[PDB]
Amino acid sequence: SYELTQPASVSGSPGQSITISCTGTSSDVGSYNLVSWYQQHPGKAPKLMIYEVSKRPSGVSNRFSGSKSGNTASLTISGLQAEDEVDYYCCSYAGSSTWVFGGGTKLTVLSQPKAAPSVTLFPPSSEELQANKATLVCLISDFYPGAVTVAWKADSSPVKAGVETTTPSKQSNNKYAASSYLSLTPEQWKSHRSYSCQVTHEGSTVEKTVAPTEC
Amino acid sequence: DSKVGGNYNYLYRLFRKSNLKPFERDISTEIYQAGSTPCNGVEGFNCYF
Amino acid sequence: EVQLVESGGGLVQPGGSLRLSCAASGFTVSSNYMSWVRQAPGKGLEWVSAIYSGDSTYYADSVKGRFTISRHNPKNTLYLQMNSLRAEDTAVYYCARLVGALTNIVVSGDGGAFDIWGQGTMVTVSSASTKGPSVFPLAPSSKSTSGGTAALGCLVKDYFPEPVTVSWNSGALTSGVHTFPAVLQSSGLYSLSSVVTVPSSSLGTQTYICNVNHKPSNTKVDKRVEPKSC
C-alpha cells in the first residue's frame, strides 16, 4: 500500500552508464543515509550488487557505482553487459528505524543478437481425447526482443475463443518465453483438418502445423 | 546464587555508550551499537542491548 | 549447511489457520537474521512480518491484529501462526538476512544487506476445495524423431489451486529440462508444461517418468511418457 516513484523502463547500450532513481520527500533531505540497490533476474530472490552507496561491497565487480545529491539521483550502472537485463530497486528509511523503497526499475540491454522464436506445437494426447478434452500446447522459446502475439489458424481461420497466452518470462539464454493454450473439444478437434500456431516476433513469423492422430 | 536451570533474575551490562564518573549509577536501558549513530535497541543483530 | 528452509505448507480455507515455519540450518536463530519479504510476481513488494523478540512496541500500521507470530530461539526454527489469512494474500514469502553495524563487517557505516534467503513455500488461501492435477502425456511426434532432438513431456491441466511440481526420472534426467509456467484460465484453472529435449534414439528404449506433485491435495502421479505406438 506504500509505494514510491521509480522509472520503470530504463535501457542503455553496453559500455554506457545509466541512472536509476527512487523518490522520497522533504522529510528525507536533512541528514539521514540508508540506500541499498537491488538486482533481480525475474522470478527468483534478489541479488546484492550495490549498498552503502559510495563504498565497497565485499565481492562485487567495481564497474557499478552510486551518486547522491538533493533531488538529483544516480544508481550509476556502467559497463553494461548482456546479463544486466534485470529488475532493480532501492532501499530507504521511513523514520524511527522504519523502511520504504521504490517501484522496481526494469533494465533492458540493447545491442543483442536477435534470435528467431523456436516454436513447438503439441496436439492433445489420445487419453486426453478419451478425457473429452483438447488442448493445443504452443511453446515459444528463445526469442528476443520479446514482442510476440500468438495467433491460431484452424484451417486458415483465426480463432480467438479459448486462447490464453502467458506473459513474456526471461529464459536462461538472455531471451524470453511464452506458453499459449487453445482449449477446444474433441468434436472440434477432429472436425478441422489442420492446426497451425504462429507468432509475430519483430516481423518474423515461425509457424508449426500439426494434425490430429491418423489412427 | 546457583540454580540447576540457571539464574535469570539477575542481569549485567557488559558495555555502555559513554564514559563514567566516580560513584555513579545508571538507570537507563540505552543501547550499545557498533560505532557512532546509535540504534536504540529492541532485540536484533549488530547492535547491543 | 547454513541455509534458510521453509516448511509447514498446507491448504488454508477461509476461517482457518496454519502454522508456517522458517528453519535456519547451520546458524542458530537466537542471534541471526530473519526478514519476511512477501513477493507477488510482476508488481511491487512489501516487508511486513514485525517480530523482533523482547515483545515491545514495534509494529506496522497495515496488519494490526492479523499476523501473530512466536519466537523459539534454541530450536533454530521460527513458526508463523499467521491467523485470519485473507484470500487476497496469494504470494510466496521468503525469510532472509540483513546487516547491522557491530562486527568486523562494519566498524564505520550503516548496514542493511539482505544476503541469504530461503526457497519459499506454496500456500494458497482459496474458498473452493483443492483438486487433483490431471497429467496428460505429450508424446513425441514424427517431426521430433526425424529432427534429431525429440520433444516430450506431460501437460498438467485443470488443477485448482496451485501448485504442481514436475520432475524427470526421479532426478535422473536434468539436461534439457525446461518448465513452462502455469496458465491462468478464464474459469480459474491452471495448466503448466515441462519439456526436455532428449536424443531421438532414446525414444522407447529409455523410460521417461515425469513426477507430478501437488502438496495441498497430496497427490503424486508418476506419469509415463511414451511415443505414439498405434
Give DSSP secondary structure letters for C153-205. Answer: EEEEEEE-SS--EEEEGGGT--TTEEEEEEEE-TTS-EEEEEEEEEEGGGTTT
Distance CA C226, CA C165 (A): 20
Backbone φ and ψ for B27, nearest 5 degrees, come out as -125, 25
With cell 534426467, the residue in question is C173
If we measure between CA atoms, which residue out of C70, C72, C69, C67 comes closest to residue C24?
Answer: C72
B6 in reach of chain C (CB within 8 A): no
Extended strands (E) in A110-201:
118-122, 134-143, 150-154, 163-165, 169-170, 176-184, 195-201
Resolution, given in Å to one decimal, reads 4.8
CA-based nearest distance B11→chain C, Å: 15
Residue in C47, C113, C181 nearest the CB of A169: C181
**Rounded distance, CA A13 to CA A7, Å?**
17
Residue A180, classified by CB atoms within 10 Å of its CB into exposed (0-12), middle (13-18) or buried (19+), is buried
Asked if the C-beta of B47 comes within 8 angstroms of chain C's C-beta atoms, the answer is: yes
Provide the 8-state DSSP code for A26.
Answer: G
Report whether the peptide linkage leading into residue A145 is cis, meaning its omega lies within 30 degrees of zero: yes
Strands A176-184 and A163-165: antiparallel
Judged by CB atoms within 8 Å, which residues 174-213 of C form the interface with A? 178, 180-181, 183-186, 191-193, 195
Q: Is A100 on the interface with C (CB under 8 A)?
A: no
Q: Are A24 and A92 in contact (CB under 8 A)?
A: yes
* Facing C138 at nearest CB: one of A51, A99, A125: A125
Reduced to 3 states, what is the DSSP secondary structure of residue A101? coil
Cβ of residue B39 closer than 8 Å to a chain C Cβ: yes
CA dihedral C55, C56, C61, C66 (to 10 degrees): 20
Name the grid cell of C174: 536434468
Task: Give the pairing of strands A105-109 and A9-12.
Answer: parallel
Q: What's the rounded Cα separation, in Å, for the pair A98 and A25?
A: 15
Please report which helix (H) or strand (E) contains residue A19, including its range. strand A17-20
How close A157 comes to chain C (CA, Å)?
A: 22
- Decide if A59 touches C, using CB distance below 8 A: no
- CB-CB contact of A154 with A161 (8 Å): no
C141 inside 8 A of chain A by CB = yes
* Cell output for C189: 484453472
Minimum CA–CA partner of A177 in chain C: C180
- What residues contact residue A5 under an 8 Å CB cut-off, 6+ apart? A22, A23, A102, A103
Cα–chain-centroid distance for residue B11? 9
Answer whether C101 sits within 8 Å of B46, measured CB to CB.
yes
Residues A66/A54, Cβ–Cβ less than 8 Å? yes
Burial of C116 (0-12, 13-18, 19+ CB in 10 A): middle
Residues in chain A: 215
Task: Note whether A176 and A170 are within 8 A (CB).
Answer: yes
Q: How far apart are alpha carbons C59 and C36 in whole angstroms?
A: 14
Rounded Cα gap, residues B35 and C107, in angstroms: 6
Query: At a CB cut-off of 8 Å and minimum separation 6, what does A142 contact?
Result: A115, A116, A117, A118, A171, A173, A175
Region for residue A203 given its phi and psi (left: phi exceeds 0; alpha: psi -120 to 50; beta: otherwise): left
CA distance C42 to C89: 15
Say which of B33, B36, B42 has its CB closest to residue C52. B42
- Rounded Cα–Cα distance for residues C146 and A109 (Å): 37
Name which of C157, C158, C219 is nearest C193 in CA terms: C157
Task: Give Cα B12 to chain centroid, integer Å.
Answer: 7
Check CB contact of C32 with chain B, cutoff 8 Å.
yes
Whether the CB-CB separation of A83 and A171 falls below 8 Å is answered with no
- How far apart, in whole angstroms, are the C-alpha atoms of residue A33 and residue A69? 12
The end-to-end CA distance of chain A, in Å, is 57
Positive or negative torsion for Cα A24, A29, A31, A36: positive
Adjacent-strand bridge partners of C195: C153, C178
CB A77 within 8 A of CB A66: no
Closest partner residue to A137 among C45, C99, C155, by Cβ?
C155
Q: Name the residue type at position C13.
A: Q
Q: Output the furthest CA–CA distance in chain B (Å, rounded).
A: 41
Closest residue by Cα to residue C175 from C199, C154, C191:
C199
